[PDB]
Structures are given as C-alpha cells and as structure tokens.
C-alpha cells in the first residue's frame, strides 16, 4: 500500500495526488510512514466538501491522543491535553477569539502591518546587492504578527526558541522521535514560565484577551493557549509568505498587472491561497460512527484525510489548475479549509498576505537572484518553507 506523506517538500506537488484524484475511487487507502496506521485520503474537491461539512467526521477525535495519525509523534507535550482550539471554545471563549482574530483585530493592526511591510521592503531596496526575503522580510513580519497580535512582545531569543520548537515538532521526518516530543515539552515549559508575563504586557494581543477573560484560566491552560498560537500561527504564516513570494517572483506579468491595477490585489491574495502549496500533510477527521462517502464505507474510528493542495489543484473544480491566474472565476479555494474548522486566523493571514503582495506590487523588478530549482527547502516540515529566498532588484 501507498505510504504517506509523499515527500514533496518543495513547491512541486507530488504526482501521486493527481494520480489518486483521477483514480476510480473517491477515497483511497494509504498507510502512515511514521506510525503504520491505515488512513483514507481524499483529493477531489467535491468529495472533500462533503467530508469536511459532515460533523460526524470529527476533528477533535482525530486530534486526540491515541488516534490513528499521519504524523510520527503526538503533537503535544506529554501529560498535557494538547487538544487545540477546542480547549478555548469549550471554556466559553468564542467571543474573545472573535475579538482577537476577527475584523476588529484587523482594523487595529492593519496599519502597523502595512507600515512594517513597506519599511522592510524599503530597507532591502536601499541595499547594494542581493538579500534574502525569508530572513530579511518574512521572518521579521511573521515574528511581529505573532508578537503583536497573538502572544505579546518576544525577545529575539524567545522568538528563536519558539520557531525552533515549531520547526522541530511539526515534522514528518528529519529529527528523532524523542527530539520531536521534547520540542513540545520545551514550548509548554516556556509558556508555563512566561505566558502570564506575556499576557500582562500592554497591547491587545490575543493571549492577553484570553488570560483576562471571565470564564480564570490556570497557568497550565494559558500555556496550552500559547503553544496553540505558536503552532497554528507561526510556521503557517512564515511558510505561506515565503511560498507566496516565490509564486509572485515567478510571475512577473501578474505582478506588473497588480502594479498598474492595485484594486486587483485582493483577487491575487485569494489566488495565492489556492495556488501556493503549504502543508505537506492533510487535514483529517475521524469517523465517529460508520459512515459512507461517495459509496465507500468508513468504519467508526477510521481517519480520513483531505489534501488541501490536491483539492486546490483539482481540474474538475478549477480550469487549468496549475496556472496562477488572479481573478479566475471558480469556486472557493481550500487554502483555509472548509466548514466549521475554517481557519480562524484567516483575517490576520489575509491582512499580512495583502500587505506583502502590495509591497511587492509597488516595486516591480524584484526578482529571484537564483533559479527556482536552486532554492533549498527545509525537508520534512508539515508547512513547506525554503531555507532562503535570494532576491534583488
Ligand atoms: C498565515 C497563513 C495560514 C494558513 C494558510 C492557515 C490555514 C489553516 C487551515 C487550512 C486550517 C484548517 C485545518 C483543519 O481543517 O483541520 C486552519 C486552522 C486553524 N488556524 Fe490557520 N492558517 C494560517 C494562519 C493562522 C494564524 C495566523 C492563526 C492564529 C493567529 C491561525 C489559527 C488557526 C487555528 C487555531 C486553527 C484550528 C481551527 C480548528 O481546528 O477549528 N491560522 N488554518
Ligand atoms: O487546533 C488545532 N486544529 C487541528 C488542525 C491544525 C491547525 N493548525 C495546525 C498546525 C499544526 C498541526 C495541525 C494544525 C489540529 O490538528 N491541531 C493540533 C495542533 C493544533 C490543533
Ligand atoms: O501537515 C499538517 N496539516 C494539518 C492540517 C492543515 C493542512 N493545511 C494546513 C495549513 C495550515 C494549518 C493547518 C493545515 C494537520 O492536521 N496536521 C496533522 C499532522 C500533519 C499536520
Ligand atoms: Ca493546468
Ligand atoms: Cl487508537
Ligand atoms: Na460536493
Ligand atoms: Na459549530
């Protein structure tokens, strides 16, 4: 049986996804390379909609300790719950999450986000020679997003510790199992020592809103909130922004169009979310009872995966799916998922993506300083990221 994942750590998607999509079944059996667990895999848009909109396929049951899984180790510090955003929703914090992640948070932060994107790009444009868009643009912008909107102000050393923990824990391979587990322990212990300090600093970052919310969360619960915000917000935003910059630098005609027609930038943001691959794994859900999807029986307790990259490149949903085409008129993309677990970070993500696209579109001529095939990729990360993006004007 086919093992999962497909080791497509660069922007070139594994051919397996299109092979399975065109096969004679709407759901295909695979086996986790890291655990040996049997799993089901969906690659078609129409089938993915039905799965992800059926609440009898549960995300929490697939997150839970002991579930069949695609990842080699559990994504939690041993002895903690590690059950994700469910822990905060269950504590009654939906309103707080809306305040800290929703349109009001974007209104509060979009000004400094755009000012920072411009400041960073202006500094790079002042340099003689090449620079690295990953280290010199994405890292400072994503780190500021995390500090100012999610956690509170971090030192460089704290940011480096959390980034290392995320990169070490959120992996299919490349580190030992024990190193991966200990990354989660280190992050949890960091927040046990520092979450209350971070939550008490001035600002409106989400961790402060959580800590102050009238249910009072314990130190352990606040630490779990910190770890959630790191894993959900940091490697995702950094990986995506790097990947979106590569897409843009490889499509100078599209950038020129955005330079001339800034009103088209939002359409380019949405097309980047469809076109630019991020996760090398899949969203997943556990059948909470015996279910059927397009004729295939899924037994209670079995886990079904949807590859968002596969769905976003489904030719039955998008005409010429492998073409970057801002303004294409097709269905909604799956870059933020689908259904009740749709990314609650989507407003802040779109804000930072838009700020980046506009910073690039204002400065035509930005190009890669090496060929795309010369970009080196971190191998095995859940969320693709290049080691560097050499660039120049
Ligand atoms: C920047 C690019 C981002 C992308 C492309 C992205 C994408 C996604 C996707 C596809 C999901 C759905 C997973 C599933 O269905 O199981 C998701 C969930 C989630 N995202 Fe985002 N995300 C991004 C940024 C962020 C940020 C900045 C935050 C927080 C500040 C965040 C917080 C979350 C949380 C907490 C969930 C879990 C939702 C749930 O399980 O109900 N995301 N994200
Ligand atoms: O809140 C959650 N939701 C799902 C999807 C996910 C969203 N962002 C993630 C980042 C890494 C892994 C999985 C996800 C999950 O697997 N979870 C374990 C870590 C965070 C938790
Ligand atoms: O690679 C992963 N993706 C997320 C889902 C996701 C898909 N695309 C995303 C984009 C952003 C956040 C989460 C996702 C998830 O549930 N995982 C369990 C173990 C592997 C890890
Ligand atoms: Ca195509
Ligand atoms: Cl089990
Ligand atoms: Na459908
Ligand atoms: Na719901």
Residue numbers in the entry: 3 to 217, 221 to 398
Paper text:
On the other hand, the single mutations Q65I and A86G in NasF5053 dramatically reduced the production of NAS-C (trace IV). Furthermore, the double mutation A86G-Q65I almost abolished the production of NAS-C, leaving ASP-A as the only detectable product (trace VI). These results clearly indicate that Q65 and A86 are the two crucial residues in NasF5053 that that direct the enzyme to produce NAS-C. Comparisons among the three substrate-bound structures showed that all substrate-interacting residues, the heme, and the two substrates superimpose well (RMSD in this region between any two structures <0.26 Å), except for the mutated residues and the adjacent residues such as K289 and I87. The plotting of the spectral variation as a function of cWL-PL concentration is fitting to a rectangular hyperbola curve, yielding a binding constant of 11.6 ± 2.1 µM for the interaction between cWL-PL and wild-type NasF5053, 25.6 ± 1.0 µM for cWL-PL with NasF5053-Q65I-A86G and 4.81 ± 0.26 µM for cWL-PL with NasF5053-S284A-V288A. The Q65-A86 patch is involved in regulating the motion of the long loop αB’-αC, where Q65 and A86 reside at its two ends. The Q65I and A86G mutations result in a shift of the αB’-αC loop away from cWL-PL-U radical. The consequent relaxation of the restraints on Int1 unfolds Int1 (the distance between N10 and C2 is approximately 4.7 Å in most distance distributions). The results exclude the intramolecular cyclization of the cWL-PL-U radical to form a pyrroloindoline, without affecting the formation of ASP-A; this observation is consistent with our data that NasF5053-Q65I-A86G exclusively produce Asp-A.
